[PDB]
Every structure is written in structure tokens, then in C-alpha cells.
């Protein structure tokens, strides 16, 4: 229908933020997506400056008061390749790209105001790179993906999926390079920050619970970190989203436990609005958060009132298409509880066409945060089950290290279980499967090898190939697959949807953005070719000028459009 | 933006539209209605339609007047046209009977006398000439290459072949022990047929840049011109027969056409016609009665010659506004031909306006003073539509419509590119896109490989990629259809074939294929996708699932048309 369009589309140009930090002495960094695209904005207390002309898809995380932004944009049409401009934010809409970083893949960075300090991958290794005044230099060469989280006087901190899906700490010096690991033997760093004392200040989340350790980068000794207030360990996180040191010396915690987090200031419980909270950045002496949760839009609030500076207001009419919402905890093959965000239409009966939206990652979470297709969803009158499949961060360490060496193996069951509960709890009165990513994959390989669960699925920007993928991969997804596969070509091959295709018996609906350079389109004109082959049903979207980060409106209407029209016409079978 | 397209074209597409098949369960109209989403067949007794089919259909057999029963027409094969008759008894609306004798095939055409159902229809060995009567199924004739039944009195069949070099020959075939004979003119093609009660076929036959009905005697071939006793005919100076048959009073009805507007003659008098193109005509409770269509008016039926309307869907006051009017123009081509174009003007778009060059498939087609849904939808989305007959077109002479033959990717694509150029160049033009399907989708591939630049973007529905492979993956008629069109030349199919000239693509390219489309394959279309990504080109494209080359379903044409208006609407918002 034309008016699923129109839900859609306004889902979809609802404004949606996040925050970035403070720059231009006393203002607000945002990224909005907003007015048709993601851009860069100043707010301070009033209307927003853009910084930027042409959509961007992020910028480095600044130093408090910086007086300009590095914006990272796409230059590739989609494929990531990304070049820097900068921006200086006394003068909005003034670009200067940054010409001594050859286009990459730019994964992060923090800009100091004085060196520009990032990671990327080219084809042939992910690396740290430092930019001032003498020019690039490449501080070291990361094992794979690596991120910088802060910068303090000559150290460099930051995290690294460097083996096993754990993640390490790792250091660098700005002035001189080099690179050290921290490895932790009981999980993952999930969040730095260099103390004052010139100590990295970590989330480190272990099998159950996450804590606070300080890391001393001179030994690797490891400590735990004790606050002034017990708020926060008595929070008991599973997870620690973000920390970060305040200008007046406080340490910022977002963690979280089931989907939801919590703010906490030295220690202290900061009220916030329900949902799940980004980085706290103090501004004008407050505190200000983004906030987002299943019915409400990244927005920038205030703490502690939940004042919102900067919100894209959902629609009441949106908004009430999703009835209800619970976290039902599916019981999966081997007795793994799935936490599982489920939303009710209210535009649909009970039982009623139900969709499990897989999420992507794998290192992801539904949570109590804004899905802008499981909105769609639920406007479209679809129940929508969101399973955190074994993988799934959020829900601590041993959960997630669950599906290293196994894709297509346990975390699928746990999407078939939750399938199985959406039905047997009553919910469902047909299934669907619909994913994005790793959420594609697991549609297709569900639809492979599960043939008769669900009545159609939807795989968007899906794997197909992981051997394939592998060879068209970059340094860091190259590395990324090999830890996920375990190595395997076995694996890599076996757990391919593509060598599985005449097992499909259900309708298929692909999306793909044609210049994705993570799940590249080439496996998927194969997929087809073996569907056309095998006589197989299929449909396919092949979306122009774009890759797997949508920074459109347009694009993001391309790529979800297509996924909610063929879930509304096998609706009418 | 695209809600109201999306409101725009499902409203153009489920619109009803109406074509009249005949006269059967006695005195009642046979009519084959898109209506209620889909192509159904419904009798008309001038109250309310009759059903007689259940699930959709492609289309129905030409009923001798009067017989109590409907052959339907429909793929079985989702979408692949491997198509199964259905008989339905007119007194038993809804009860199908499949015809098992009848083994899947694509159904080119067919005639039901009664006593037996006549049909041609093509398999992977052959274009054959079948008769189905109550001793079974007989195959009377393998033909050349396409043939369709046009007529059937007693024993003699009469129909049309495209055998060879793009010309029509007649044919004739005995009902009761098959055999074959052509019949072919050195001065044109045969375009209509009927016999005449005098067992003689009269035959439309349509030269270099003229048409006129000629008799011809089956026996021994003897070509004599017929002669009606009213000259309104002649002097019309047709240079097209869409149609004739004999009434059953022994009246000869003809629908003949110039410059994209057809004219309706009873024993050559003319007889008054809404403004437009008409189809058979059949005599109902005394009156004449046709189909008519306009580029403003959907397939409708009507009495003549009163212009009232029988069976007419009514459009939406908002949609017939967005249609500000439509022109013929002749645009001078490479050689100074010139190119009967029609043109609709947007009441949505500004002068100099967005303006696509809708390419007609076939080849042998044509952009006439017709309905045209794909049109009216890019009239609706603020697009003027400039719709050239390319050499290749039927409507404007023989030789014309030959002159494609041997040259496909060649004069027919220059003449397009003259169009469009002379969209720009009138003024009517601020930016060009092309977009067509089937024959015309591979004019869009053909056009941005060999005329980088001349359109801003492109959309190519259903479109020939590659004459090579597609002739591998083709059946016994299209097979022969492609040799013809190529003239036999593999130099032809391979340097004519877009897929080979990907490198020269600068401009977006939006692809639509229904993937079970046995006329124009996917298979060589997920190989240009290959290419279009190896070579960095911008692309976008849209695969229908479980459908083919003929949409009979509301939904299945919002599948095809719908993606192709978005990606022009979001290239205009473009530079």
C-alpha cells in the first residue's frame, strides 16, 4: 500500500542523533541523521550549524573544545573508502579534506586539535595512524579491527578485535608509535579511557558480570578500578557500553544489564531516561547524554531531567502502531535462554504475521533501542521478534564467544527457537524472517537449512559466500571472518547459504546495496544464478550508489521498501 | 514523493480495461477484462459481467459467434508461458475443465470453432499448428516460425506466419487432415485475415508505405484486390489493417489505421469511431461493437457508432489532468527519415519539462493514440513521454517496418536518439531518460552503451541483453524470431548485444526482470549485473519473483512499473 510507503518513509526521516562531544569551545558535536542524510552539526541551545556540505557518515571523536571537526566520508559510492575533511567550526560548510590520507577504510579516531589520530584498513593491513603537523605517520599495524577510544597527553588507548572475537586494550605513543596489547584471560575490553594518572581506565566484561580495572600501559598490570560512589557496581552491569573522562575529572560510565543502561558519574547513579544511553559529555557545567529506546528516536537529552535538546519526534500515530513490547527469554536448543525483544503491532491481530528481525553484527544486541526496521514492522502490522542470538553482546562474555567458529550453527538455532516461541507462546500466527547483514545471512541460512520454519524470508546485504567474501575482503574483514569461521575453510564453506541453495523451498527476497565492500554483491549475483538455476522463487533489489552504511534517507527507503512490500504481499497468501 | 506515485501507479494499473474477444453463449459479448487486480474473461450481457474464469488468465481463444463455451489461455509455469487451455462451458460460469490432451506450451494464438479448439503454439522443437476436437489432438502443420490462426470456416484455417525475413506470409491449413500452404507477396506482408463465405481468405496487406485487402484463393494461390462496394476505405488510404473478419451476415468489417489512429469500415463505409484504435468488431443485438483505447482513454468496449460506452474503467479525475494532451510529430532521423513519434505531454511537468523516451517493444509495435499504462504513470510522476516508431514499428508501411531487419542496434536505436534529441532541441525536454521494456529495454541498453550522454539515466524492464546467449536459452519461435531479426548474422547478435559494450556505460541504469521470463531471460541479465559491478558501473535493478514476460496481475505490474517511476523520480531530483 501507498500508505505503508508513507510510514515508512517517515520512520525514516524522523531525525535521528547521536553525540559526539564538545567543540568550538562550549558547543555541542552531533551527527544527525537529518534532512535526508547524516551531517554534522553545532548546537548550542538553539537551532543546529551544519558543518558539513555533502553527507558524511561520522566524524572523529573530538577533544573537548576543539575548534574543528574531522568529518569521515564515504568517496567510494558506498564502498567505504573514506577520505577526512576537516571542518573548522568558526566557519561551517568550509571543507579542507585531509589529502595526505589516501581514501581507507576508516574504522575510528580522535582528533586532539593538534594530531588526528585514526584506525583503517586498506586491502592490506588495518593499522593506527597519527596526523599532525609533519604529516601520516602509521604508528602501528593492528591484527585486525582496532579502535581508538582516547588520547591523553603522549597515549594512545584503544581496542582491538585482535583474536578469538576477544578484544584487547592496546596502546600507542603519539609521538613515537609502537603498539602494546592487553589481553585479558576472564573477557573483552569494552571501553577505555586514560585517567589522569595516565593509566587506561577500562570496561572489561567477563563471562557473567563487567567491571571497572585500570590498566597501567608500563607493566599490563590490572587492577580494579574502585568508584567513590557504589552505585555502579552495585548496578551490576553485564555490559559497559562507554566511559570517558569529564573536563572536571569524573568518570563517566554508561553500562548495562538486559537491554537497558544506566549512567553513572564517579560511581554515582545519574537518572536517565529509559532506554539505552551513549557517551555523557559535560556541557555548560550539565550533563548530556544521547538517549534511544524501542519508541523513541536517537535523541540528545539532558541528565538528570530527560530534557531533550535535540529530538526527531516520533509521530503519535507511529508510535502507536507499536502496542506493546516485552523481553521474553526464548529457550533455545541446548537450554540457552535467548533474551528476546519482541514488539506487538497494533496494527496487527493475535496471533498474528510476525517477523523475527535478525540483528547484524554478529557482535550486536537488540536491546531497548530504536530499530527503525522493526518500527516499520509494526507500522506494517507485523509483530516483530528481535532474538539475541548466541553472538549477541549485551548479555556477557561467554554468550558472545558462543558463535566463534560456528556461524550458521548454534546462533541459528536460537533464531529457529525464537520462531518456535513466537508461534507456541501465541504471538505468531505466521512467521517471517528478515535480517540485515549477519541478519541476511542468518535468513539465508535459515531458509537453507531450515527450510518450512518460516513462510518467506528477507536477506538484506546478506553473506552468502564466506570464501568469496574472504578474498573480496579488505585487511580487517579478512581477519574478522577468519575469527569467526575459526580459520576453517571447511567452515567457511559448509556454513555458506550458497552451497546449500537446493535446500530452499520458500520465497526469498534480497536486498544489497551494489558497492557493500563488507558482504559484497558479487556472491550475491552467484546466489541468484544458482536460484535462477534451480528454479528456485526469488526476488532481488540491487540498490545504485551505495554500500552497507546507509547515509541517505533515500537509501535507507531503497533497501527497507522493498523488505516490508514483500512481507505485506506473502501476508495476502 | 513516492507515496504518491506509489498511489499513481497502482491507481493506472487497476484501473479496468477492457478487449473484446467475440460473441458467444448465444447472444452475450466475450470480453477480456483487467479488473479486480488481474485478466479474467467475463461475458457481457449489457447488464453486469459474468466470470467464467477462476484464477487469472492470459488470454482467451477466438470463439466462432455464438458457441456455448470459453477457451482460457493460462501459464501454468509461473510466468515462463508454458500455458494450458481451460475450457468453460458459457452456461456454467467459474467450472474450468483443463484440456489434458494438451501438453504445456507457449499458446501463440488459437480459434475455437465448437467442434475443435485450433491452435498454434511453440515448444523448444517447433512452432507447430494443433487441432483439439473430440478425437483428440492433432498436430495439422509445423510451422516456420511464429504463426498465428486468424480465421477457421469449415475445414479451411487460415492464419499468419512470420516466416521469414520479418515478412508475414499467409497460411492455410485443412482443419480435418492438416497440410500447409504459405502464401507469400513480393509486395508486403499479410497483416489480418478472414475467409469469406466463398471459402477465399481476405487478407489485409500492408506495402512499402500503403495498405489495402486483397483476396486470396487457397487452391492455387491466385492474389486478386478486393473491391468493396462502399470506397470510404480506399479513399482513407490506410497504411495499416489492424483487423478484419466477416460478420455473420456476410458484412465486412475492417479496422485499418493511419498515423497511429485506426478507422472502422463496414463493406468498406466508414462508420464512426471514437477517436483512437479500435479493435475487431463484432455485430451484437443489431449493433456494432469494438474496443477502443486513446492515450487518455484505457481499453474500453463501445457501440457504434454512437462512441457509448459498454464496458469502460473510469480514471480518476486527478490522473486524466496529468495528462495535459498528446501529438504526433515526425522527427528527422540519421538519414532523413522521419519518425513518427507520438508525444505525451505531462500537465505535471513544466515546458522545457523531465521527459522520457518510453521505447515500444517487439520491434514490431507501435506508439500509437493508445492507452499506454507505463506512459500515463510517467505522465502522472511530472514526465513528459516521447514514444518514437523506430524503423522496426508496425503502422507506418512495410518497408518502414522492415527496414530494422538484419540491423537491430542500428537505425532503430538512431531514430530513438533522434527523438530525444528533438525533445531537447523543440524545447520540451530540460532532461532526457529512456525506459523500455522487452524490445525497448534493450533500446535503453543499447542506447546508454553506444549513446553515453545522451540520456541522463536509463530503465530497461524485460530487456535483450544478449542475442547470443538468449538464443541458446530460447525456444523453436524465438529462436527463428531472433534469426530473423539479426538476419542470420552472429556478428550481429554478438556486436548488437549491450552485454559487450558495458564499458562504454556512464549514466545509471535501472534493470527490471521478471525472473521466470522465457522470452527474454534472466540468465543474461544477472551476467550484465556481473559486468555493471566488475566495471564500477552505477546500477540498480529489480528481479519479480515468479513471473515472466506477460503480466497478467495488478501486483505484478506495480512490481515492474513501480521501481522504474521511483528511479526516474529520484534521478530528477538529481543534476
Same mark, same amino acid.
Given at each position: 500500500?501507498?500508505?505503508?510507503?508513507?510510514?515508512?518513509?517517515?520512520?525514516?526521516?524522523?531525525?535521528?542523533?547521536?553525540?559526539?562531544?564538545?567543540?568550538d569551545g562550549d558547543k555541542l558535536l552531533v551527527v544527525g541523521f537529518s534532512e535526508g542524510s547524516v551531517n554534522a552539526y553545532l548546537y548550542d541551545g538553539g537551532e543546529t550549524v551544519k558543518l558539513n556540505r555533502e553527507p558524511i557518515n561520522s566524524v572523529l571523536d573530538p577533544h573537548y573544545g576543539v575548534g574543528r571537526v574531522i568529518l569521515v566520508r564515504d568517496v567510494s559510492?558506498?564502498?567505504?573508502?573514506?577520505?577526512?575533511?576537516?571542518?573548522?567550526?568558526?566557519?561551517?560548510?568550509?571543507?579542507?579534506?585531509?589529502?595526505?590520507?589516501?581514501?581507507?577504510?576508516?574504522?575510528?579516531?580522535?582528533?586532539?586539535?593538534?594530531?588526528?589520530?585514526?584506525?583503517?584498513?586498506?586491502?592490506?593491513?588495518?593499522?593506527?595512524?597519527?596526523?599532525?603537523?609533519?604529516?601520516?605517520?602509521?604508528?602501528?599495524?593492528?591484527?585486525?579491527?582496532?579502535?581508538?577510544?582516547?588520547?591523553?597527553?603522549?597515549?594512545?588507548?584503544?581496542?582491538?578485535?585482535?583474536?578469538?572475537?576477544?578484544?584487547?586494550?592496546?596502546?600507542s605513543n603519539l609521538s613515537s608509535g609502537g603498539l602494546r596489547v592487553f589481553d585479558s584471560g576472564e573477557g573483552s575490553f569494552s571501553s577505555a579511557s586514560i585517567s589522569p594518572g595516565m593509566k587506561v581506565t577500562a570496561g572489561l566484561e567477563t563471562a557473567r558480570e563487567a567491571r571497572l580495572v585500570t590498566v597501567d600501559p608500563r607493566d599490563g598490570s590490572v587492577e580494579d578500578?574502585?568508584?567513590?560512589?557504589?552505585?555502579?557496581?552495585?548496578?551490576?552491569?553485564?555490559?559497559?557500553?562507554?566511559?570517558?573522562?569529564?573536563?572536571?575529572?569524573?568518570?563517566?560510565?554508561?553500562?548495562?544489564?538486559?537491554?537497558?543502561?544506566?549512567?553513572?558519574?564517579?560511581?554515582?547513579?545519574?537518572?536517565?531516561?529509559?532506554?539505552?544511553?551513549?557517551?555523557?559529555?559535560?556541557?555548560?557545567?550539565?550533563?548530556?547524554?544521547?538517549?534511544?529506546?524501542?519508541?523513541?528516536?536517537?535523541?540528545?537529552?539532558?541528565?538528570?531531567?530527560?530534557?531533550?535538546?535535540?529530538?526527531?519526534?516520533?509521530?503519535?500515530?507511529?508510535?502507536?502502531?507499536?502496542?506493546?513490547?516485552?523481553?521474553?527469554?526464548? @529457550?533455545?536448543? &541446548?537450554? %540457552?535462554?535467548?533474551?528476546?525483544?519482541?514488539? =506487538? +503491532? $497494533?496494527? #496487527?491481530?493475535?496471533?498474528?504475521?510476525?517477523?523475527?528481525?535478525?540483528?547484524?553484527?554478529?557482535?550486536?544486541?537488540?536491546?531497548?533501542?530504536?530499530?527503525?526496521?522493526?518500527?516499520?514492522?509494526?507500522?506494517?502490522?507485523?509483530?516483530?521478534?528481535?532474538?539475541?542470538?548466541?553472538?549477541?553482546?549485551?548479555?556477557?562474555?561467554?554468550?558472545?564467544?558462543?558463535?566463534?567458529?560456528?556461524?550458521?550453527?548454534? @546462533?541459528?538455532? &536460537?533464531? %529457529?527457537?525464537?520462531?518456535?516461541?513466537?508461534? =507456541? +507462546? $501465541?504471538? #505468531?500466527?505466521?512467521?517471517?524472517?528478515?535480517?540485515?547483514?549477519?541478519?541476511?545471512?542468518?535468513?539465508?541460512?535459515?531458509?537453507?537449512?531450515?527450510?518450512?520454519?518460516?513462510?518467506?524470508?528477507?536477506?538484506?546485504?546478506?553473506?552468502?559466500?564466506?570464501?568469496?567474501?574472504?578474498?573480496?575482503?579488505?585487511?580487517?574483514?579478512?581477519?574478522?571472518?577468519?575469527?569467526?569461521?575459526?580459520?576453517?575453510?571447511?567452515?567457511?564453506?559448509?556454513r555458506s547459504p550458497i552451497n546449500h541453495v537446493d535446500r530452499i523451498k520458500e520465497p526469498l527476497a534480497l536486498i544489497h546495496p551494489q558497492n557493500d565492500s563488507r558482504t559484497p554483491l558479487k556472491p550475491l549475483l552467484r546466489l541468484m544464478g544458482e536460484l535462477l538455476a534451480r528454479g528456485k522463487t526469488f526476488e532481488a533489489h540491487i540498490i545504485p550508489d551505495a554500500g552497507?552504511?546507509?547515509?541517505?534517507?533515500?537509501?535507507?527507503?531503497?533497501?527497507?521498501?522493498?523488505?516490508?512490500?514483500?512481507?505485506?504481499?506473502?501476508?495476502?497468501?
Amino acid at each position: 500500500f501507498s500508505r505503508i510507503v508513507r510510514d515508512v518513509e517517515r520512520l525514516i526521516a524522523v531525525e535521528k542523533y547521536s553525540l559526539q562531544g564538545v567543540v568550538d569551545g562550549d558547543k555541542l558535536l552531533v551527527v544527525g541523521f537529518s534532512e535526508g542524510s547524516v551531517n554534522a552539526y553545532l548546537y548550542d541551545g538553539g537551532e543546529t550549524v551544519k558543518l558539513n556540505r555533502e553527507p558524511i557518515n561520522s566524524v572523529l571523536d573530538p577533544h573537548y573544545g576543539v575548534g574543528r571537526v574531522i568529518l569521515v566520508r564515504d568517496v567510494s559510492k558506498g564502498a567505504e573508502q573514506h577520505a577526512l575533511f576537516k571542518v573548522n567550526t568558526s566557519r561551517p560548510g568550509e571543507e579542507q579534506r585531509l589529502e595526505a590520507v589516501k581514501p581507507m577504510r576508516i574504522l575510528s579516531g580522535v582528533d586532539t586539535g593538534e594530531a588526528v589520530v585514526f584506525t583503517g584498513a586498506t586491502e592490506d593491513r588495518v593499522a593506527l595512524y597519527a596526523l599532525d603537523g609533519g604529516g601520516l605517520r602509521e604508528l602501528a599495524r593492528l591484527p585486525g579491527f582496532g579502535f581508538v577510544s582516547d588520547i591523553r597527553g603522549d597515549l594512545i588507548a584503544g581496542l582491538g578485535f585482535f583474536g578469538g572475537g576477544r578484544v584487547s586494550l592496546f596502546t600507542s605513543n603519539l609521538s613515537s608509535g609502537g603498539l602494546r596489547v592487553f589481553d585479558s584471560g576472564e573477557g573483552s575490553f569494552s571501553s577505555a579511557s586514560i585517567s589522569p594518572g595516565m593509566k587506561v581506565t577500562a570496561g572489561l566484561e567477563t563471562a557473567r558480570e563487567a567491571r571497572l580495572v585500570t590498566v597501567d600501559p608500563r607493566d599490563g598490570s590490572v587492577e580494579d578500578l574502585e568508584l567513590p560512589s557504589k552505585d555502579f557496581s552495585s548496578y551490576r552491569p553485564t555490559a559497559i557500553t562507554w566511559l570517558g573522562y569529564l573536563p572536571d575529572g569524573r568518570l563517566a560510565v554508561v553500562a548495562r544489564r538486559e537491554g537497558r543502561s544506566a549512567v553513572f558519574i564517579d560511581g554515582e547513579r545519574v537518572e536517565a531516561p529509559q532506554g539505552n544511553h551513549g557517551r555523557v559529555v559535560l556541557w555548560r557545567g550539565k550533563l548530556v547524554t544521547s538517549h534511544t529506546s524501542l519508541s523513541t528516536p536517537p535523541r540528545i537529552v539532558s541528565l538528570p531531567s530527560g530534557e531533550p535538546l535535540l529530538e526527531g519526534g516520533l509521530p503519535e500515530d507511529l508510535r502507536r502502531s507499536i502496542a506493546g513490547s516485552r523481553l521474553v527469554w526464548v @529457550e533455545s536448543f &541446548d537450554g %540457552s535462554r535467548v533474551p528476546t525483544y519482541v514488539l =506487538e +503491532s $497494533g496494527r #496487527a491481530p493475535t496471533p498474528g504475521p510476525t517477523v523475527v528481525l535478525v540483528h547484524g553484527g554478529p557482535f550486536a544486541e537488540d536491546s531497548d533501542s530504536w530499530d527503525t526496521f522493526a518500527a516499520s514492522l509494526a507500522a506494517a502490522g507485523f509483530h516483530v521478534v528481535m532474538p539475541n542470538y548466541r553472538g549477541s553482546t549485551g548479555y556477557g562474555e561467554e554468550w558472545r564467544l558462543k558463535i566463534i567458529g560456528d556461524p550458521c550453527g548454534g @546462533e541459528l538455532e &536460537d533464531v %529457529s527457537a525464537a520462531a518456535r516461541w513466537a508461534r =507456541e +507462546s $501465541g504471538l #505468531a500466527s505466521e512467521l517471517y524472517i528478515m535480517g540485515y547483514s549477519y541478519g541476511g545471512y542468518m535468513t539465508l541460512c535459515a531458509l537453507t537449512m531450515k527450510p518450512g520454519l518460516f513462510k518467506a524470508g528477507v536477506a538484506g546485504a546478506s553473506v552468502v559466500d564466506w570464501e568469496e567474501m574472504y578474498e573480496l575482503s579488505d585487511a580487517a574483514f579478512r581477519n574478522f571472518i577468519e575469527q569467526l569461521t575459526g580459520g576453517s575453510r571447511e567452515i567457511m564453506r559448509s556454513r555458506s547459504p550458497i552451497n546449500h541453495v537446493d535446500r530452499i523451498k520458500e520465497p526469498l527476497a534480497l536486498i544489497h546495496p551494489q558497492n557493500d565492500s563488507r558482504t559484497p554483491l558479487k556472491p550475491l549475483l552467484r546466489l541468484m544464478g544458482e536460484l535462477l538455476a534451480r528454479g528456485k522463487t526469488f526476488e532481488a533489489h540491487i540498490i545504485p550508489d551505495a554500500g552497507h552504511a546507509i547515509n541517505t534517507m533515500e537509501d535507507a527507503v531503497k533497501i527497507l521498501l522493498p523488505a516490508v512490500f514483500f512481507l505485506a504481499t506473502q501476508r495476502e497468501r
